[PDB]
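To the structural biology subgroup,

Please find below the input and predicted structure for Thiol:disulfide interchange protein DsbA/DsbL, which we are adding to the shared reference set this quarter. The sequence is reproduced verbatim from the submission form. If anyone notices a discrepancy with their own records, reply to this email rather than editing the shared folder directly, so we keep one authoritative version.
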Amino acid sequence: MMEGKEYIILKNPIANADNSLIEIFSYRCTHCYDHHKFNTMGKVKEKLPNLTYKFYPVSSMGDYGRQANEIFAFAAFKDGVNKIDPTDKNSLTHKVAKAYFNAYFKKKQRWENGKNPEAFYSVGLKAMNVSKADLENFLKTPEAAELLKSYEIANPISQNYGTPAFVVNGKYQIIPSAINSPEALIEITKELSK
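Predicted structure (tokenized):
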């Protein structure tokens, strides 16, 4: 509960993020994979059901960060329409992250280092069971523009301590040395979110 020990105050806050825990992550981030395997954010949601939980991908990370942002924005949008929390293991967000984490870390896939975005999109499109056209049409919408703009802030936040980064109410990033357990993450989030 002390600035500079458990948390820092972001110089610029995430817009529209009151009463929320947001995980800034990358598909090519190993600890992000760990936190997905043990569904950390889902554990927080269980103990703090009334917060909003989001995942902000980091477009500046990986050869395909910019394409991943599109796919995750589409998953977030659809999870929203479907009223499934993105920390739910049945969400499209979770299914998409699982597929990319699996591909990147277990299969050591790199999709030709940036030269084959079609193969990269396909992992996410298959995971969501939608077509490339669905994605192209989503990307024409204002809802897509808003999600993709909101994700821009994940890039400067990721430079504070790397990924994953945990941001509460859009204003405070939990300092990673303070997160010694999901219990600690929950306690800190509960303190910072009131």
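Summary notes: The longest strand covers residues 20-25. Strands lie at 7-9, 20-25, 52-57, 165-168, 172-174.

Regards,
Lab coordination
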